[model samples]
Target: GMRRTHYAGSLRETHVGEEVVLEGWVNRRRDLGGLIFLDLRDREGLVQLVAHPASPAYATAERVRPEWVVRAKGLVRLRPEPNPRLATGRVEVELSALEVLAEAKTPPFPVDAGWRGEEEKEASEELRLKYRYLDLRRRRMQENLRLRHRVIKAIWDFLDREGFVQVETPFLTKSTPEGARDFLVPYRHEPGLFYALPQSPQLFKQMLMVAGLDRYFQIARCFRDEDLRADRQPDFTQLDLEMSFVEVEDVLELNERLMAHVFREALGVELPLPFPRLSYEEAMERYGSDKPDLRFGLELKEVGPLFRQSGFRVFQEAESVKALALPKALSRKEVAELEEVAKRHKAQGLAWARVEEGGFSGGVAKFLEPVREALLQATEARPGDTLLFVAGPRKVAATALGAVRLRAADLLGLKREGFRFLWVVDFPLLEWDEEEEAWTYMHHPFTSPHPEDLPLLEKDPGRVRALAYDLVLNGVEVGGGSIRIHDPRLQARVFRLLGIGEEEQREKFGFFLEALEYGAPPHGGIAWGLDRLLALMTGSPSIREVIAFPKNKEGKDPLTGAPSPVPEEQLRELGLMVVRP
Candidate 1:
């Protein structure tokens, strides 16, 4: 029947005269002579507990082990020696009463400092994931969870003030071509029918605009059946929003202001408003990545023109030749390793030249002797610098050299800290899908082609630009959106361009196309990967750090053993059967 007055970690000297009842798990315990010291831990933090031989709780404290949940009624007293490292370091609880609420078994691993530090040399990821309930008890996870909450709140507050309505979209929906593959859910009632978990609320949110909800927003949970990566999950969340009667600029402006508010409110960091903008072509040409990491400088340079008349067949025949200059000269071994990196990215091989006192050395440098001065000048090379080049088709050269740019930045320790946001706009409307043998939407088929490019869309679709943009932070694409094609005819045109025939278009997005026939407004919206954004804000290497109950690399929940087989009866009930390999 005892009630707690204060959290174990919230007390200070101001509370020294007052009696308090604190409840929490024992973080650690130590004994010296007849005195016992216990660190009581809760979601907030840890507080020191003192129980002397004469104290009423002394006997109970002696018997309790680490992680045992207990309630203590005590006087808040000043510590003999204050520890500045902790928030409640100046005070200690002198226990007069103790009650064991629950007894706990020894944890599989230490959940304090050991589990908190990534470099702690602690348990492996498999072990930690298997015991994630215990793993989440760490201070790091506690802080990360809090940060995630605050971030979502900030988004809500910002959008609310902007006259946006918070709306919930359906988790189960008809499948649309949203880039990634969808995770399907079986429909037992309709034997052969299934529901696809939405990859994004793309269609519903657009429908919201047609429904006359001018501004809609949702903290949406999305599912994608895709390969796992550091920033990906089988199921993830995003800040989904749509605005009616808006263009590309409207969406971009709103997001920039929203981000500024979020960073300031959640992290106390001031992000500059009206982030710089770059054309998609410019970003690709200069940084080799649409989402370029603006924190570093080893920009890619096209040097193909300088070698148009060169004797080196590699440079002369290349569709494009790109170069990256390292701030410092790399050893022969490092150069060889970088070549392999380029090779892995589909380049034939990497050509490198170390800028020496006299001229360049190694990797086609002798072949380019006549134009060595021009090559070095084009790459902006200096004596202490090493220049790396990739020569091949334009796509291969850009991709391989772009990768080298990032690698070189890492090697040179040139990537500076702090947030750098940019809007990459005007992406190519369509790209030739070699495998599909047809054109594919660069962003999505619904994205509006630039009005000026409509004529070119019919004649030369490759030259048309989409009114789409990406919000990039550091090096990651945090968000993306486009001014959607609202007119049914325009939508139909895009569908046809993607090689979807009339029957197939009606089969896939008939409802959506019909919705567009109604009075649809000029609408544009953006979806921010809330998990990825939080990961960057918190400086976490992986997005999973910010998500609770995250699936492991294999997309299995080690804690719950999910993605397991169902019984035969259950499968039969669903009109489905397990197909064994």
Candidate 2:
């Protein structure tokens, strides 16, 4: 074995004329005035080694190349001039001699800390993944992966202390009827049978509770054949957990301690404990999303009632009562930019009126009617504020207006820095799918309906709310879970609402119902998106930055060039054939 002083370590001591050994990948090399200056890099960071013309074996320097693994004997001494930026800034190593352990051809692109955030580093994700080994060598990638390790370690520590047993769940499992599409594996022995990859460990954790393991948790890998986003992956990691005989409050309170533990211990982010929460209705109405960004507050204001008689047919017929109010925002240029945002949400016309001390005045002033003063009072119009209205169905009006409100606030630079987490609770039990002309689970059918609203399901299922909650951080849903319905009757009702006839329920979820028959206890759990939490804690714009080996937006691995062709024989064995879409 060669001597193993790191690249940065050889620059630390002042033992001049003493022999020392160092090893690292050559970072850069330059020749000047018959001398060579070589920069070597290791995990500890980089250091400079010099070879003088008078030194023996200087001929070895002629063969040096970037990324060459090498070992060298040197004398550690004070530098002629110190580089204050380096950790071991006051010293350098004067080479006695060197040996190249390995040599390499030039890299396709530069790999150094200096390349970060540059256009060179911003190559297509496809290329980055295909050359993932080269990509991971970039210092930024190393640091992020290191941080991810620390985060997972922190989670293990917290869960262990909380008396939670980390249970290992199977990746292959039965598929539920409703949810994101599944990725299935064929059963070769069974010929025509198949096993579906688990979307989540939801079933296993619940079973653990029934089996008398009261507290269970897993850093589960969940697969979902769904559209991807900046904060999501087709297959991702989540903290799957459950405790029996618990209510919504019990689960939420425990999560608070875990979240605090991770943020404070791992990232040194002092999260405000007992994070503020809003109902789903409130979040959607105020922020235009169930996950509201609470750092800024340009909350949506309803103007539908005020505009009902404004002689505007659009507002009068719109289902969602209309409302508009500005942030009392900055310049005209900013408001003009907001107009473009209004168009994105499909607002037909952004009705506008700016409030002045004398009264409101703008393009829609003529349509304000004799009740213009009433409109101002109803919409909370104030001087120096602008009103923007969306006239459409309730959902459309709320969404468009909310987007406009948030965009206007953004233009005015209102979002606060650091973490802002909220819990959005009381989601509706089901959503009407207009295209399909049927009702579907807003979350999943397993989620329990609010106790009081259980009767409403049979009478008017549309009005029933679910006992669900989403943990939102910085305008994103980092986790979501619910109190599950252990009652067989309630579960059957949910199946009915999904329009699943009794026979179909037995066909898809029969085993699940049978398990409940053996006396399942009331239970609930929440799964936190470990990727998302790390991303926010680390200030990454997207979760991909924090995840190692993340797939691109189209759900293909860039590295190793995955989702590729399989052997024809393998396909034949599985009784499957490729079909072009």
Candidate 3:
């Protein structure tokens, strides 16, 4: 039996001459000048262990290979030449004895910190995912996972201190479609039916509010059968919460405090209290995005009114037009490339003007001689500034211009450092779905329309705004929520607007509908994507970096080969059969 007393990485200069037992895997092994040295690694980091000819561990050290599990009895010694790069570099363990607890096969990929070969450095993601267990042993992955744990613990502590009860809702629930597709699980006993994994504990968390649980929170597991993106997954987690007898502001304030607390505890960063806010319309108008990145300053300016009487038909027939003033001018080739970016967002085309000493040149400036002064005035363009324009439907123009703004920011390196949080509020409750020829909820059907806008729901549903808000970090929407409709009549009205007929509503959400009819309290809730948040906090390029066992973009677990074929007998038992294309 091996008795390990301390982690290998825990020894420091202060622990010199102290006898200790360490257990870890060999991170690296080297033999130099008849002396053997091994870098022992655990989750914390690496510690160097030296073996001399006099030591009982000398033979074992010579046999040890990278990734071999080992136990060592040694005395900590201060290193003559300290490697400042490592935390435990100031000390090394002089081993008295060593035991190879387990032998490991040669790794397919390098596990050493000094790995810099191009092939190893740029190893295929599919290969890394297939050996995720070995990949998780890397120092970067270890730190990311540990940081994730600390953040989650801090969130749990903060909610607990705020009088929130951590109650878990069910993993198995009704298959009421909200937005994305649901991941179905067949019920073997009830052959024809299936249960859907929760997209969020949306309905149950609200039911908790109705059950008089004044404050409820859960670090919950969620699933969505949707197309994958860098920040999306078939399964994920969210920090879900719901409160009773509260309004939008109440929920917003609590969440802000919670976020500030998370930042302070996890990263020791003090976020300024009361984040800046923008109306939904203002955000779209100014930045062409609801989740505006306040770190940069390429604010979109409305130049449509100035161009209303212009000769350019694109500007004249447009519903709205916007411009982003570049800090410096771009060449014809660069500007043309930028036009491609706007076109990618489905804009008719991009127009631009290069402000010169006397007047502007290029683009629709030829047709805008009368309004060149007005355009320059509206966009506040300087001599060296370049203005880019997108004109068409209000939505298309804003979206296209917004995309170009971000592209320009990236090119110019205008996005500042540190976090910038913005609250985008007062979103339209319903958007007219032209393709569907119906109305769709802006956030969800349960989101309540503003009190004043409730009357406009029937006459002009598109004009009605909801009491919804999103917590935007930089330019990413980390979380969003709304004041939920507790009143059954109001809920029914919203459902109807969304084309959920009376019978369909009852069939899909009958239990929730009936619950609302009872003494349900006025409630609201918010859910944050835990995966996305951790990725941002860790400065990772993709959310997959922060998740331990995330699927690839194709939503297949390469490690376990999930979403694969099941045995015929098992499928028959669940009353299901696979149809191959």
**TM-score winner between candidates 2 and 3:** 3
Task: Return the TM-score for each candidate structure.
Answer: 0.96, 0.90, 0.96
Candidate 2, which ten residues in sequence have the lowest lDDT sum? 112-121
Q: Each candidate's lDDT (Cα)?
A: 0.86, 0.78, 0.86
Candidate 1's residue-wise lDDT over 123-147, tens digit each?
Answer: 6877888998888998887889998
The lDDT of model 1 is 0.86
Cα misplacement distance, residue 80 of candidate 2 (Å)? 2.4
Candidate numbers sorted by TM-score from highest down: 1, 3, 2
Question: Candidate 1: where are CA atoms >4 Å away?
Answer: 114-120, 433-438
Tens-place lDDT per residue, model 2, 1-581, is 63674445345655555666788788789898988978777766777788888776477877898889888778777778877766556666788898888998887777855422233346666677777787787777777788788878888998898888999988777865326899988898767788898888887777787788878988988888887788788888898788788889899989988888877877787888898989888887877777788887666776656656556677677776565677473456765676678767766767776778866676576676456677766667667877777777766677777888777766666757888888899888886664586776767778988999978988998899889999998787899999998988888978887688999988888888888888889998889888888788778777777777888878888676688999999989988787889
Name every residue pair that clashes in candidate 2. Answer: 129-558, 129-559, 130-558, 302-323, 303-322, 303-323, 304-321, 304-322, 320-394
Candidate 3 ranges with C-alpha deviation above 4 Å:
114-120, 433-438
Q: Residue 130, candidate 3: how far off, in angstroms?
A: 0.2
Root-mean-square deviation of every model: 1.9, 3.1, 2.1
Evaluation by TM-score, superior candidate among 1 and 2: 1
